[PDB]
Amino acid sequence: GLKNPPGPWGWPLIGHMLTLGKNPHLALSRMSQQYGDVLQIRIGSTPVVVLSGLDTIRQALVRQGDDFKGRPDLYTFTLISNGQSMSFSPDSGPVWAARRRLAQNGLKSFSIASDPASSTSCYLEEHVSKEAEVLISTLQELMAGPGHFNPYRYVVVSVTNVICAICFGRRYDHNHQELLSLVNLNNNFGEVVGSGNPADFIPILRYLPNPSLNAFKDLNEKFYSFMQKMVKEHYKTFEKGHIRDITDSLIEHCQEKQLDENANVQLSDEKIINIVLDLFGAGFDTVTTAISWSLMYLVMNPRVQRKIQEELDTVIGRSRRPRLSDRSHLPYMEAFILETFRHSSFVPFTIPHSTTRDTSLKGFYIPKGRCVFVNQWQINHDQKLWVNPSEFLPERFLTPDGAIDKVLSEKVIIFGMGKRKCIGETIARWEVFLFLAILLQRVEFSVPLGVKVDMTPIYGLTMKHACCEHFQMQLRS
Ligand code: HEM
Ligand SMILES: O=c1cc(-c2ccccc2)oc2c1ccc1ccccc12
């Protein structure tokens, strides 16, 4: 008594490739209106099941986590972390789970934990405060110079410096060339790794001239080399009872593992150590992208920049910088961050999943090994859940008093769910908050009338906007 998931008809050789088009999240949302929460398509010859709906997605990822925690064996994933990525490899067994645990401990220990150098505050707040100021300074230098800027160029360095501090104990000047070459120079990582990339489904596209994929390979080689340069320096300078950062903790773990008698061979030193890259990659890109959207939204909705400015002044004043502890007392800042997440849904699909065994979901049979997409954009824009999905309205998360409506904030899905949920979620929420709170308390961003500011997401794993050279900032009265 179990059926196959329904879905539309497809071309016999390419399936639904052309229907996905350039915006698969939009196409598949429409498609779920007709066929429901569990539907099936084909890209090339590969079946993919696509999921939507809060509860359906919770049912699969959480209630049946183990069934759906896999990753499909895609070509493009074989190019990340030298084919041995924690996050993207086909391994979702005990080696994976162990790597996952080390990354979580790494994170907690070097972000949320108390900075020794500060009684009051944690590492993360320490690094974000430092970089927030440098950033302010830097933007000034440009207003006093050309009078406008592309904010991304500068945000990306500031944000990279935070996660860089945590992973590698280093930071970089806003003009360092090697860094800019890493995180601001043909970073199409997200573009190629987005759900539905044809190259992962049409074998010939891999071997044809493909500027995208070559760029993607060069990017991965560079990131890998950078990790390696950095790991060598940490080894050379390792101090045995002084763990400076995550890379040190992974070196330590490798060391400890050398005096096990039956040391497990599959959790290699390489797989223990390259963890630091998956963190660094995820950490710089998604958070940079989030703040970049937040800015675009501020500059297109001055009404909201002001309301936030007002809440900061009222709740904290211009007597001191804001702090993590003020997060709980700044519910309009929360509403604005939530609505940035909802409206942009800049991570529209999770990284694709895979079934780890035969299973069933809402009466549908799903065989082991089936590639599964998980459509978060659909949840965040569902017309049955939200009033004007298409409008930027922070106020939708506020009660009549002006407190955050908890039940409604919990329907923003942008970090996944279940076994493969973002492990960066708390850092990401605190980092965006602090960066915004510290910035908006002291400056104002704007763009002039009469210039094009494209607000159209460009598809990928993280969805970017086109570069905007017209940002302006002014200190506050
Ligand atoms: C706004 C910020 C962020 C968003 C929206 C975000 C979102 C996500 C999403 C949607 C996933 C996919 C879940 C899945 O495949 O089921 C993911 C995975 C992941 N995130 Fe994030 N993330 C963010 C920030 C971070 C940061 C700061 C880090 C690390 C410092 C991080 C580390 C990861 C890692 C390692 C994974 C892979 C987990 C796994 O494969 O098992 N993320 N994140
Ligand atoms: O830009 C990236 C985003 C992301 C990312 C990762 C997880 C979730 C969302 C974005 O990852 C990477 C990126 C770049 C290089 C990477 C190298 C190894 C592993 C991950 C990398």
Curated annotation (Swiss-Prot):
Glycosylation sites: 32
Result of altering residue 442 to W: In allele CYP1A1*10
GO biological process terms on file: 9-cis-retinoic acid biosynthetic process; amine metabolic process; camera-type eye development; cellular response to copper ion; coumarin metabolic process; dibenzo-p-dioxin catabolic process; digestive tract development; epoxygenase P450 pathway
E.C. no: 1.14.14.1, 4.2.1.152
Main location as per UniProt: endoplasmic reticulum
Annotated heme binding sites: 422
Gene Ontology cellular component terms for the protein in this record: endoplasmic reticulum membrane; intracellular membrane-bounded organelle; mitochondrial inner membrane; mitochondrion
One protein family per Pfam: p450
Keyword Plastid: no
Induction trigger: By 2,3,7,8-tetrachlorodibenzo-p-dioxin (TCDD).
Membrane topology reported for the UniProt record: Peripheral membrane protein
Catalytic activity: an organic molecule + reduced [NADPH--hemoprotein reductase] + O2 = an alcohol + oxidized [NADPH--hemoprotein reductase] + H2O + H(+); estrone + reduced [NADPH--hemoprotein reductase] + O2 = 2-hydroxyestrone + oxidized [NADPH--hemoprotein reductase] + H2O + H(+); estrone + reduced [NADPH--hemoprotein reductase] + O2 = 4-hydroxyestrone + oxidized [NADPH--hemoprotein reductase] + H2O + H(+); estrone + reduced [NADPH--hemoprotein reductase] + O2 = 6alpha-hydroxyestrone + oxidized [NADPH--hemoprotein reductase] + H2O + H(+)
Cofactor: heme
Disulfide bonds: none
Pathway per the UniProt entry: Steroid hormone biosynthesis; Lipid metabolism; fatty acid metabolism; Cofactor metabolism; retinol metabolism
Keywords: Cytoplasm, Endoplasmic reticulum, Fatty acid metabolism, Glycoprotein, Heme, Iron, Lipid biosynthesis, Lipid metabolism, Lyase, Membrane, Metal-binding, Microsome, Mitochondrion, Mitochondrion inner membrane, Monooxygenase, Oxidoreductase, Steroid biosynthesis
Record: residues binding substrate: 189
Keyword Repressor in annotation: no
Single GO MF annotation: monooxygenase activity
Functional description taken from the UniProt entry: A cytochrome P450 monooxygenase involved in the metabolism of various endogenous substrates, including fatty acids, steroid hormones and vitamins. Mechanistically, uses molecular oxygen inserting one oxygen atom into a substrate, and reducing the second into a water molecule, with two electrons provided by NADPH via cytochrome P450 reductase (NADPH--hemoprotein reductase). Catalyzes the hydroxylation of carbon-hydrogen bonds.
Membership in a protein family: Belongs to the cytochrome P450 family.
Protein name as it appears in the record: Cytochrome P450 1A1
Species this chain originates from: Homo sapiens (Human)
